[PDB]
Design an enzyme around this catalytic site. Structure first.
Site, mmCIF file in Angstrom:
data_model
loop_
_atom_site.group_PDB
_atom_site.id
_atom_site.type_symbol
_atom_site.label_atom_id
_atom_site.label_comp_id
_atom_site.label_asym_id
_atom_site.label_seq_id
_atom_site.Cartn_x
_atom_site.Cartn_y
_atom_site.Cartn_z
ATOM 1 N N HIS A 73 1.060 -2.362 7.832
ATOM 2 C CA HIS A 73 1.458 -2.004 6.471
ATOM 3 C C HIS A 73 0.681 -2.817 5.431
ATOM 4 O O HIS A 73 0.753 -2.535 4.241
ATOM 5 C CB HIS A 73 2.984 -2.112 6.263
ATOM 6 C CG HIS A 73 3.496 -3.514 6.119
ATOM 7 N ND1 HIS A 73 4.666 -3.811 5.445
ATOM 8 C CD2 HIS A 73 3.016 -4.698 6.566
ATOM 9 C CE1 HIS A 73 4.877 -5.113 5.478
ATOM 10 N NE2 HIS A 73 3.889 -5.678 6.152
ATOM 11 N N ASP A 100 -2.879 -4.559 0.204
ATOM 12 C CA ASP A 100 -2.802 -3.792 1.445
ATOM 13 C C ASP A 100 -4.180 -3.335 1.907
ATOM 14 O O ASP A 100 -4.355 -2.202 2.353
ATOM 15 C CB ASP A 100 -1.893 -2.581 1.266
ATOM 16 C CG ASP A 100 -0.443 -2.971 1.035
ATOM 17 O OD1 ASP A 100 -0.122 -4.185 1.068
ATOM 18 O OD2 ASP A 100 0.370 -2.049 0.821
ATOM 19 N N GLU A 103 8.835 1.114 1.453
ATOM 20 C CA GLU A 103 9.287 -0.240 1.768
ATOM 21 C C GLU A 103 10.709 -0.579 1.311
ATOM 22 O O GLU A 103 11.063 -1.747 1.217
ATOM 23 C CB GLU A 103 8.289 -1.295 1.278
ATOM 24 C CG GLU A 103 6.907 -1.230 1.950
ATOM 25 C CD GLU A 103 6.879 -1.803 3.355
ATOM 26 O OE1 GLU A 103 7.906 -2.342 3.820
ATOM 27 O OE2 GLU A 103 5.811 -1.725 3.997
ATOM 28 N N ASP A 108 2.142 -2.297 -6.411
ATOM 29 C CA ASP A 108 2.382 -3.181 -5.283
ATOM 30 C C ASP A 108 2.127 -4.639 -5.679
ATOM 31 O O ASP A 108 1.291 -4.910 -6.533
ATOM 32 C CB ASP A 108 1.423 -2.775 -4.163
ATOM 33 C CG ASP A 108 1.953 -3.096 -2.783
ATOM 34 O OD1 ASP A 108 2.521 -4.187 -2.602
ATOM 35 O OD2 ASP A 108 1.776 -2.257 -1.877
ATOM 36 N N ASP A 137 8.188 -3.304 -3.659
ATOM 37 C CA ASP A 137 7.992 -4.734 -3.885
ATOM 38 C C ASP A 137 6.995 -5.018 -5.011
ATOM 39 O O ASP A 137 6.739 -6.170 -5.351
ATOM 40 C CB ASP A 137 7.644 -5.496 -2.597
ATOM 41 C CG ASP A 137 6.200 -5.314 -2.154
ATOM 42 O OD1 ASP A 137 5.957 -5.506 -0.937
ATOM 43 O OD2 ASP A 137 5.305 -5.025 -2.991
ATOM 44 N N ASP A 164 4.972 0.915 -3.783
ATOM 45 C CA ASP A 164 5.654 -0.035 -2.925
ATOM 46 C C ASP A 164 6.702 -0.702 -3.802
ATOM 47 O O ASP A 164 6.381 -1.270 -4.856
ATOM 48 C CB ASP A 164 4.657 -1.055 -2.381
ATOM 49 C CG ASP A 164 5.295 -2.095 -1.467
ATOM 50 O OD1 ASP A 164 6.528 -2.299 -1.501
ATOM 51 O OD2 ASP A 164 4.544 -2.728 -0.700
ATOM 52 N N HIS A 202 4.647 0.792 4.436
ATOM 53 C CA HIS A 202 3.473 1.252 3.697
ATOM 54 C C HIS A 202 2.268 1.713 4.535
ATOM 55 O O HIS A 202 1.323 2.286 3.986
ATOM 56 C CB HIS A 202 3.033 0.215 2.662
ATOM 57 C CG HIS A 202 2.625 0.819 1.356
ATOM 58 N ND1 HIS A 202 2.468 0.078 0.204
ATOM 59 C CD2 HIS A 202 2.368 2.103 1.014
ATOM 60 C CE1 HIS A 202 2.114 0.878 -0.786
ATOM 61 N NE2 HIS A 202 2.052 2.113 -0.323
ATOM 62 N N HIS A 232 0.991 -6.496 -3.392
ATOM 63 C CA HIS A 232 -0.081 -6.713 -2.427
ATOM 64 C C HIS A 232 -1.134 -5.618 -2.515
ATOM 65 O O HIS A 232 -0.843 -4.507 -2.951
ATOM 66 C CB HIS A 232 0.493 -6.730 -1.021
ATOM 67 C CG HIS A 232 1.706 -7.583 -0.890
ATOM 68 N ND1 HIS A 232 2.983 -7.075 -0.954
ATOM 69 C CD2 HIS A 232 1.837 -8.922 -0.738
ATOM 70 C CE1 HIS A 232 3.852 -8.062 -0.823
ATOM 71 N NE2 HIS A 232 3.181 -9.192 -0.691
#
Ligand SMILES: C[C@](N)(CCCC[B-](O)(O)O)C(=O)O
Ligand SMILES: C[C@](N)(CCCC[B-](O)(O)O)C(=O)O
Ligand SMILES: C[C@](N)(CCCC[B-](O)(O)O)C(=O)O
Ligand SMILES: [Mn+2]
Ligand SMILES: [Mn+2]
Ligand SMILES: [Mn+2]
Ligand SMILES: [Mn+2]
Ligand SMILES: [Mn+2]
Ligand SMILES: [Mn+2]
Lengths: 313, 313, 313
Positions: free
Chosen positions: A136, A123, A272, A119, A229, A227, A96, A121
């Site tokens: 990332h 980031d 990712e 995401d 995830d 992302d 990322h 997260h």
């Protein structure tokens, strides 16, 4: 829609190598052919070749800063070139950190862009708040104008100019946010729908509000940084930082179907995907399959069905 | 928040023994350390030692009545002591019969308490309606004032005084209710959100209404009795009476995050975790992991993130 | 409620044979006994014996047209007979082509019926739009009055008279619709809630609108044609055309519980259960278990609980 594919086989934004195979496995899944099967005009701009930077020691805690910074510099260029040819940039990552380059090059062409960040997260660690040192987990800090004053001169990143304001981005899917990141969220007044808000409101209202938030004042091009995830690991297990309790496959498709319907999708990151991390072959295909699915939705594939402008009867 | 942990390694409310290891496996998961990692002031009041009652024959159909009744008598004492020290009681079970003691001792200190019961079951069989004879399926009948007239004098329970009214409790998660239990629900006018209502309304509105129902008239301390089988067995498989179609991990966290936000959480039961019943080691860790997660949410851990009252920039 | 069970061990609407065992495995699961355990008056009309049509070559692309057409002719008869005896027809399939016969025979008795079709597919290909030639993907085209003009005279189907209008049917669960099918949807103005609408609205509003749509003008008998592949393959894996991202077990039960509550359920199809396709024994029991569950909900089994009209206290 009209698409410019760019592969970014790059991993130095985090520790695990397998993510540089993302473009390969997505291509092998039939991504390009499937896009063409849709209403899609697709040009493949190829896989970017990211030259070795063998001398790339940590900047303080920050790891591989020159490699990361160069890869994003190269990517921004490539994206800007595809944006100039009138095409929706489709970046296949890759970790990322590449988001620094993709949004940057995009905003060169379309400075009024708005970002949707899907995401687990945020980031948004700075090089000073990060504890991992993995770039990332910092791309958003490099792009926010409000944070320009808290980003040290990290080797590899002198080319960067923050291009988005705290009010041009919406997060969807958050469920593992670092304390410094949470502080930044609440301090800069960033718009987010964590898994809690998704639970509270339903993905329908979430998308309603997200688009209303970004498109309310006026229409502007949309950048979706996805992302994988962001989705629950029961759908995208082959990824570096999986967090349980994610967006469902259905929510994933709903988000992207709604984004497609705006007609303003301008840039897209699918990031990712790491085949190396699949505990089994099926975990790998499961992840890649979901990634293609999300991508196809971004470019018009609808669950209710699609048909060409003809009389089928 | 400020917490008083009490282990209740007790199983005689039902047939399977492994549930007395609940406190052990939760502690081993790092529950106390994780609570301290939060804003939490934690005192461990230790594991209650439940003396053998070797002479404990059925009362009619009701099994182990003296053992169950004593364990709850001991627990009520322990809870009342932690409530007097100004702490949120955290009972690690142990089978759900312990709920008789936990709510009882809690209400000694805070008689105006309201109960939220998260569970696939209503646990409201009387000793006369139960067909199983398992006391973990009857605790609510012993506590309801309205049912005082239909509870026989069961050996071990002469110490009990019903302490809640039909209108001080809300069930969330119901999906396997016995006929006599359903009769009691509709007759006493008990407030419930079965899986059907959760499906209909969404967990957001459910929590809205549940808190509005309990806190509308006035603020009062909240007792959350959480049976891990309230959640789908895909999240909490290692439990005695799993029922498919449960609350999701996300709904589980949403409930507890919302309860935390009231600032009125006063007592908490995490019940029916049974490691022995995990078909695999991962099923055991999966269950224990979810249990810790739900607990951490109860005491402030939020999916959007947490930060200390400092300037992280 | 009062039920007339009819087994339809028939598979020639598609390629895989195992689906003719549907009635057997559902019966073995205890379907009849479980219905009786409810408030249910149940008469088993037996398994229909579908005579071999060894001479049954394709009509153009359309496969086994005479076998399919006969089986539905026989079934329509059987359904009409059970509808005349004042009973809710319960057809255990068998592939979904049987829907031509079940709705047909039903409408003979109750021409004002409305159809709810739960399925990942619209099953509305004509013999001219189908690319597969499998008749289980065409039943709705044979029944729609509006499409009478685009259905060729297919051997085996001269007995058919279209009995429903585009506005007497609602689809729920759609996620793999062919282009010609989508064209038909939008052209005839068919009411549907694809997975996208379910995501957007929640299953609560979906059912609200679906029943409002069918029952608004006036009360009329309801026909529920339930293809088990409408549900996610994580619940019903043992089925011929599974599509990921389906209705949950909970949504499945919610739909049927709400339909039961109308008191207007008149005909029911439980279709496409194929034990042969279970990758494991548990996948087979998982599918059959879900099928029974959906069926029990249709006839009164509620997640909040059930009780007989007596005083349990
Ligand atoms: C702990 C973490 N916040 C993880 C970041 C994960 C990055 B990803 O996957 O691109 O979202 C950090 O390293 O700063
Ligand atoms: C059949 C049953 N209703 C099961 C009760 C389950 C108790 B648990 O897990 O604490 O909710 C009974 O024994 O009365
Ligand atoms: C590709 C397909 N649309 C699949 C139909 C599936 C039939 B089912 O399971 O009864 O819904 C076709 O053959 O026409
Ligand atoms: Mn992430
Ligand atoms: Mn990310
Ligand atoms: Mn329970
Ligand atoms: Mn319980
Ligand atoms: Mn189907
Ligand atoms: Mn079907």
């Amino acid at each position: 829609r009209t698409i410019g594919i760019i592969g970014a086989p790059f991993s130095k934004g985090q520790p695990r190598g397998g993510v540089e195979e993302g473009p390969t496995v997505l291509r092998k899944a039939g991504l390009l052919e499937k896009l063409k099967e849709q209403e899609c005009d697709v040009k493949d701009y190829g896989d970017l070749p990211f030259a070795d930077i063998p001398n790339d020691s940590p900047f303080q805690i920050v790891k591989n800063p020159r490699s990361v910074g160069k890869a994003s510099e190269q990517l921004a260029g490539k994206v800007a070139e595809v944006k100039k040819n009138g095409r929706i940039s489709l970046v296949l990552g890759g970790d990322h950190s590449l988001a620094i380059g993709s949004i940057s090059g995009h905003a060169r062409v379309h400075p009024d862009l708005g970002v949707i960040w899907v995401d687990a997260h945020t980031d948004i660690n700075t090089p000073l708040t990060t504890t991992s040192g993995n770039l990332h987990g910092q791309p958003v800090s490099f792009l926010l104008k409000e944070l320009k004053g808290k980003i040290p001169d990290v080797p590899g990143f002198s080319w960067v100019t923050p291009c988005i304001s705290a009010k041009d981005i919406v997060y969807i899917g958050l469920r593992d946010v670092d304390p410094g990141e949470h502080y930044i969220l609440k301090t800069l007044g960033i718009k987010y729908f964590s898994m809690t808000e998704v639970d509270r409101l339903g993905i329908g209202k979430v998308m309603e509000e997200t688009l209303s938030y970004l498109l309310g004042r006026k229409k502007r091009p949309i950048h979706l940084s996805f992302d994988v995830d962001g989705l629950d690991p029961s759908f995208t297990p082959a990824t570096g930082t999986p967090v349980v309790g994610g967006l469902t496959y259905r929510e994933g498709l709903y988000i992207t179907e709604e984004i497609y319907k705006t007609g303003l999708l301008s840039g897209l990151d699918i990031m990712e995907v790491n085949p190396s991390l699949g505990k089994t072959p099926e975990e790998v295909t499961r992840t890649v399959n979901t990634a293609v699915a999300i991508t196809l939705a971004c470019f018009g594939l609808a669950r209710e069905g699609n048909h060409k402008p003809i009389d089928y009867l």
